[PDB]
Amino acid sequence: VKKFPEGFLWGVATASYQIEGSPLADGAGMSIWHTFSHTPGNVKNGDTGDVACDHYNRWKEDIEIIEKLGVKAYRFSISWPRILPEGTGRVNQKGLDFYNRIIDTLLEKGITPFVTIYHWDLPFALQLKGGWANREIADWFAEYSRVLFENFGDRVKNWITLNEPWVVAIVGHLYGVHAPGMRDIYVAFRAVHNLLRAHARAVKVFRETVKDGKIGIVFNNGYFEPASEIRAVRFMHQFNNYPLFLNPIYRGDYPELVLEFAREYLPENYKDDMSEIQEKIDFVGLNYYSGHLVKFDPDAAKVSFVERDLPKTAMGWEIVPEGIYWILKKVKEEYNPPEVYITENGAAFDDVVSEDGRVHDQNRIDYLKAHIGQAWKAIQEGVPLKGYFVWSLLDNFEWAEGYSKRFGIVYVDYSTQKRIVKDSGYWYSNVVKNNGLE
Numbered sequence: 001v002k003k004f005p006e007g008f009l010w011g012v013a014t015a016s017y018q019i020e021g022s023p024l025a026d027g028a029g030m031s032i033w034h035t036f037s038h039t040p041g042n043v044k045n046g047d048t049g050d051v052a053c054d055h056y057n058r059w060k061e062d063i064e065i066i067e068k069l070g071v072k073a074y075r076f077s078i079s080w081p082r083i084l085p086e087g088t089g090r091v092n093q094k095g096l097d098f099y100n101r102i103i104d105t106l107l108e109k110g111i112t113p114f115v116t117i118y119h120w121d122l123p124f125a126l127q128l129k130g131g132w133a134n135r136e137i138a139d140w141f142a143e144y145s146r147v148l149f150e151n152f153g154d155r156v157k158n159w160i161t162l163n164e165p166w167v168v169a170i171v172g173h174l175y176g177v178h179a180p181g182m183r184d185i186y187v188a189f190r191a192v193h194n195l196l197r198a199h200a201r202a203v204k205v206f207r208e209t210v211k212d213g214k215i216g217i218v219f220n221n222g223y224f225e226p227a228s229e230i231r232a233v234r235f236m237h238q239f240n241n242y243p244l245f246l247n248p249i250y251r252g253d254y255p256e257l258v259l260e261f262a263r264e265y266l267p268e269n270y271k272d273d274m275s276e277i278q279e280k281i282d283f284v285g286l287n288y289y290s291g292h293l294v295k296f297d298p299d300a301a302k303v304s305f306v307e308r309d310l311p312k313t314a315m316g317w318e319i320v321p322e323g324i325y326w327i328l329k330k331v332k333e334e335y336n337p338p339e340v341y342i343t344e345n346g347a348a349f350d351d352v353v354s355e356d357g358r359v360h361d362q363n364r365i366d367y368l369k370a371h372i373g374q375a376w377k378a379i380q381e382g383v384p385l386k387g388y389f390v391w392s393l394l395d396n397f398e399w400a401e402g403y404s405k406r407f408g409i410v411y412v413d414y415s416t417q418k419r420i421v422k423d424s425g426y427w428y429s430n431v432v433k434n435n436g437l438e
């Protein structure tokens, strides 16, 4: 037996652009993911979020799936351009209506909503004004967040400002692999800094508007091990993991090795913003998927990855369950946040529907079991983990990989939009019902 604390929150997670489709329905503005995916060469197979899982129409069915599995929490995100089509100013009631219905339905069914305010679908109108590169986005984001709090804060009490701000800044503005598809290191570090400022403004407004909820922020994390008997592992953790952001929030500056690498790229007077960035948060959400062997490498960031002969997912990600334990221990050790959630953990496998009508994803059961087991351990050793969210409820649009990578515990047949609960979803429901592993 590995039984979790009473009231531990078992969840599933999605994001608006990955599942919804109908990006321009009911007066919604374009997002940067709409324009990025409609640009040839950016996304595998020319795939876009035009239809995705058609959750925009099938939302009731999908929630009924969450209910039927007995899953206790649903992490989903709100499309900023459905709410404010030009990013600021005008509010679109039909956009609010869409999320109102989802929210009321969840509550009616006893499911706890966790709302991600920003999961990467920036209004295109704001991107024309520089998007995350423009300091003014702290204001635009604060106004957007205020609208959400005023409309939904009576019912939704668990909020996340940003999903994976490292990805948004670095994959979006340095690697150019995600919207808005830029490759400029100075822009990417200004986006890091402005993501922090916007995050802190939204928390500040949250305290003024929703005096009963909790708000936090979500980071991607890798488990970095050194290829030999070091500092490159230190750098990768500080740069790619929660410290890039938590060091400002908790300690009022960027991590030491980040400054060593990136000081020239930050605004000259960036410290002027740090006391505001220290706005108190209620919880930290950590996403975790993979471990990486890392070694120093002259002329790289001075770091390269070393391939290991370990089980991998369809992403090529090495399966390293101990990583989730490590990152949970490490966050308590470094910043001691009052609550932590695992806001995403999951895997992509080449799922197939058998002749029996089933999806026998034993590889995904094995992945989830092992990571839940390591999360359990962290809890036994004092980490205040309050919940765990499987990425994802549904197979969906996996960004620049398009539909070619399936992360769901529910299979989606894209030709018919049929949902087929996978073995891993059945398995997970039993875990939730039991409040743990057996």
Ligand SMILES: OC[C@H]1NNC[C@@H](O)[C@@H]1O
Residues within 6 Å of the ligand: 015, 164, 287, 344, 391, 398, 407
């Ligand atoms: O790559 C898998 C997931 N990672 N975190 C954020 C999600 O949007 C991704 O699909």
Ligand SMILES: [Ca+2]
Residues within 6 Å of the ligand: 038, 048, 050
């Ligand atoms: Ca289209």
